[PDB]
Amino acid sequence: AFRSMVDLIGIPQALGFTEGQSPEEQWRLLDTLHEDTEEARQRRAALAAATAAIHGQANAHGVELGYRYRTGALV
Amino acid sequence: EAHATPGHLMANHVFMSTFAGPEVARIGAYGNGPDRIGEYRAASPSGLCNLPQHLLEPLLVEAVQEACVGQLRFG
Amino acid sequence: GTAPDIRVPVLIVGGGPAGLTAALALSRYGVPHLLVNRHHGTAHTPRAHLLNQRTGEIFRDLGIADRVEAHATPGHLMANHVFMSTFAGPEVARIGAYGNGPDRIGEYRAASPSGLCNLPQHLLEPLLVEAVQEACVGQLRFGHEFVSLEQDEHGVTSRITDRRTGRDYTVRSDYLIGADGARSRVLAQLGIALDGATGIARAVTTWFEADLSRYSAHRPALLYMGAVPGSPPADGRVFVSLRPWTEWLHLTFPPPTADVDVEDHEAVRAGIRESIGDPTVDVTIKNVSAWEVNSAVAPRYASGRVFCVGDAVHQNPPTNGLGLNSAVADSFNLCWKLKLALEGLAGPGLLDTYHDERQPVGRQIVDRAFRSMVDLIGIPQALGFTEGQSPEEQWRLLDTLHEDTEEARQRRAALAAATAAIHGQANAHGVELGYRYRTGALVPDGTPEPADERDPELYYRATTWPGARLPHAWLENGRHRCSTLDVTGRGRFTLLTGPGGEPWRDAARDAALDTGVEVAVLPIGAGGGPRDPYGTWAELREVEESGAVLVRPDGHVAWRARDHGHAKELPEVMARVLHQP
Amino acid sequence: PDIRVPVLIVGGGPAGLTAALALSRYGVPHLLVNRHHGTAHTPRAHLLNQRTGEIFRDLGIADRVEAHATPGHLMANHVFMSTFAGPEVARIGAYGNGPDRIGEYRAASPSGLCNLPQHLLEPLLVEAVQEACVGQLRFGHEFVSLEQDEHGVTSRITDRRTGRDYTVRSDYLIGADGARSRVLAQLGIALDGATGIARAVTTWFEADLSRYSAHRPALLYMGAVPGSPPADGRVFVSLRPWTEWLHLTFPPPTADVDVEDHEAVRAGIRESIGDPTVDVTIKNVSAWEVNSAVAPRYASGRVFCVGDAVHQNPPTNGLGLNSAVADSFNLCWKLKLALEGLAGPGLLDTYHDERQPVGRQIVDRAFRSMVDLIGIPQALGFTEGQSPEEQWRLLDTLHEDTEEARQRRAALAAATAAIHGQANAHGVELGYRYRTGALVPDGTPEPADERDPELYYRATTWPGARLPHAWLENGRHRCSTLDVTGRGRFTLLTGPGGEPWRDAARDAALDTGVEVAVLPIGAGGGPRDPYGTWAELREVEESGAVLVRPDGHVAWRARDHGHAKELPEVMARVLHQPD
């Protein structure tokens, strides 16, 4: 749960959002994300990696069902 | 189950700007994506659902009062 | 030389699913036509019923998928394929079906915007008639019989009989579609003979009502295959769910020897009550129909200006339900090509690709449907069932199947092997959706065809390899959810591109100018066009952001290019796809 | 240029979205830009007349619109009252619901009238355009200026969120940008007629008024709070019977209107209702500057303006939105032919020649219908400087056996009769005829009679008229004459003996490059005319022809098969193709 909470800021960071930006500044970064620039190719890759980490909260099937007791009321 | 939101209405995890504005990213959630749905169906007789505590707690209380084996004292 | 009574761009002979699909496609493309159908009504019995994902996608293109879906049994009620004794007695085996099992469900949902569904022909044909009547582009004539044709360099002259009046008339068309079913009179007139054995069996099909929900709701299936204890393995009883759980077909396959009295509802009712194995179920017969099962495919699908579709060119047993689906996909392959030929934007080069693309598919479905038919007898054989056994002997073989002994462990294993072959008809995703055109209206890219170690009949593998069906991905146009297959097709060529694809505008514009054929450029993830919200399209397209995938009116891939450097190639490519001289 | 597209549409209101949807159905790539980020957020215009209904059937959205709209039978009356809870003043049948008009309304069109406000209609149009995926919508994008030359239009656009500027180069531009149109200003065209001729304050509100409304269903309830001057009318508009409403006032120009003073709007509405126990919830208050104005010109070079850009009027008659839809539907099939190179500026000039006189008509009619409203309370003997008690007295003595009371009775009956010009204006709504444009006169005189042609519709195939509705049957499929024509193509309707029209249609197709589909009715295995209605309305012989445009208006007709060789030449003149 802690690591999942920390993963959430990774999305807006991938988009190049920071403190001290105007609305227009952040709208511009949203719009430019799909351009054929190297800058835009990189943010696109950083977004994809930050998104993939959210599987650890959205589809964490081994955490939810796959825990196993290794000592206790068992032989 | 009669009261809970079913699994198919929790199908995505969405990253966006405003709710009315452009979206940023999306993944399948809670085993709804085609790459996880098979594993989630084979793993349990049960689905995932959404039922908040102000609705769940009264169901447990009613089931305990109906059994009349133990005694609840609130306050 | 005399004038013909009627002059029309296209004449369709036959108004079953293949001919009505052709009339609807030509209606959508605004091509006047005439269809003649010899029977006065549409199908009066269920016949073919299983609609696969590819048929779903073609009905989405033709704008009737919602009407079909409102009537059809949904895919989750077709969840199993069942083998049993009687309906009321012990079960023998079970597999997931039509992609409902956990091991297939994900691949099925990834592969298509459409599910599978069950809608019998007596309900599907009236929907197609209604959509054709509403468009009012072509004209239907039921009770009109095709007698004969001659063709030449410039057209086709057909003689037609009005069966009510007995009067004769003549139609002149640019092209003719043979959609006239098994024993195509149109195919005989062309001089094309089928290859494959004839009357390889008889099926008796009884359409009946009975409430069997007690024996079926806990194991929902399209098919429940039964064997009454005391019967030879070849005496299989097939129940087909048409309206869960009250309306049914019952199929038997009598010896090539015995007396089938289709009119003897007494004998048929008794047989069905025996197959049910509960004498307290009410059976109401609606129809009893004998049918001659063959397996045959035409070596040639076309001759000059005449092109045959559907059951005219391929016949097979009902196993796999490929017949109706393949009829729909045959007409959908042909009609956009005729639209281009009639507009003088293509010629016989493009029309020749109908036989080139669709005849190997005919060979494939007839082969697959035949092996599935033969697979069925493996189940009762694996149990130790044979000719000459009492009911009590066969009940003993079912009872002792679960014993701790060598004999039972071996029968158990033959049953598991016979059961697993049934995936060849219940989960044949690769046959249903994975067929690829290797020659026709496509330009190879130089890359080798995708391939892997999985059985290619069972498993579908999405690809943009030219010839293949365009991969499905969910897109979003503004807030409108739509497939890659919903923003392509619809009677036009589309060039799917991405960031850095601006070079493709000039190339499509030049291609349009040179061929006279519009190429709509559709940028995904760029130019304010549809978005790819999951990134699935980017993973499936097998080209770079700046490359292109060229999609035909029928949603198959004509060509693709890795990157924008190949833009200059597009005009020459379009000219070759259209086979323009 | 940054973008190259065949058609640029400026404005995503009803007119612009109708244009996008038509160009989408015709397969023509286009781009639409709309300065607001969203669709209409308030009801605004709401009455859909039968002609708009037919256009939405052609464009394939009529069922989606019908599923959400108020049906015609709940718009059965137009009511004049005191308070909503008090005594009624007068009542007429509305929108063809009255026994004396229902037969003509049902015979005239396969469509009824219905009520769907703009905040619900615009999203349906957007969804239809998004599903077709032929054009691109861009909300939050503002047209700044244009330049045109002999080959195209060059437009400057600002993305409002990024403040980024870009240029669009198009073959044609559609000015669909509403009142005070930036596009029409750029063409140097000034509207003719008055501006700020009044203010309307429109409150969108919720209140259960079924007790005062369900027994006399109406779209419009026009009230007068006793003790107020005639000009101080209160208009209730039913949006969801009988719980969702608009309330309109027309403040004097000297009065000061605070849109944000909800407590005061609410107090006025409770006063209009006359029952302080009804609970009112304000959803929205708007002040609207009302004009009556029409552009003397609708187009200039390759730029065409539609809808509120070229006409503005009071809301009386509800003609504004219906006219906007029919402006776009007139233009788009013409653009499709120009773009394919099968027609030129000559066809495109017929947009102005056909739609501009309709603009003049609807502005005139909406204006007279607004002036008519005050005749009701004037007929009652209401004036300024009367107490509530004095106006209650005039209402209660209306029915006395006096000279005085008989005369006001008669003035009320005359003022009420005039409201037929806005409640049952069937001739204005459906009966307009294009006298010059993409049509060839046949030399017959235009049908005319002594009935008021604003009130009465008269079905005709006289070239320029809308094709008459008749119910046909195609096999067992029920369909209008309007449903088997239009849909982006020219159609030639014929009957028995009409075979010579086939070769004439081939020859027209060869000469013009434009297909003419021949459709025989009651012959050749075509659609049947089960009642004989079409035979009665077509005003040609069995062997004659009616030539129908993509927009369902008649281009030409011929009495019999002797005229067949005229067709190739007629088509070339309809398309205004070069000599």
Ligand SMILES: Cc1cc2nc3c(=O)[nH]c(=O)nc-3n(C[C@H](O)[C@H](O)[C@H](O)COP(=O)(O)OP(=O)(O)OC[C@H]3O[C@@H](n4cnc5c(N)ncnc54)[C@H](O)[C@@H]3O)c2cc1C
């Ligand atoms: C009795 C029967 C039962 C069947 N049951 C099954 C089943 O259970 N499962 C399954 O998968 N498949 C079944 N089939 C096959 C299935 O119906 C076809 O695969 C499917 O209908 C597609 O066929 P089609 O459109 O090519 O031809 P058809 O449906 O056979 O239609 C051809 C049409 O052309 C008409 N025709 C024939 N001669 C002429 C002429 N000279 N002029 C004009 N029209 C003419 C016929 O009247 C017919 O309407 C069955 C077929 C038959 C005949």
Ligand SMILES: Cc1cc2nc3c(=O)[nH]c(=O)nc-3n(C[C@H](O)[C@H](O)[C@H](O)COP(=O)(O)OP(=O)(O)OC[C@H]3O[C@@H](n4cnc5c(N)ncnc54)[C@H](O)[C@@H]3O)c2cc1C
């Ligand atoms: C406040 C108000 C209230 C109304 N209420 C009623 C009523 O009660 N009854 C009635 O009958 N009629 C009413 N109408 C009139 C009715 O709304 C119009 O007749 C109808 O909307 C047809 O309009 P249209 O599509 O021509 O233009 P509009 O609905 O005005 O839409 C034009 C669009 O273009 C956009 N635009 C403007 N400039 C630019 C630019 N530079 N770039 C891009 N986009 C631009 C606008 O933002 C708007 O979305 C009202 C009008 C207004 C202004």
Ligand SMILES: [Cl-]
């Ligand atoms: Cl028959």
Ligand SMILES: [Cl-]
């Ligand atoms: Cl559909």
Ligand SMILES: [Cl-]
């Ligand atoms: Cl519709």
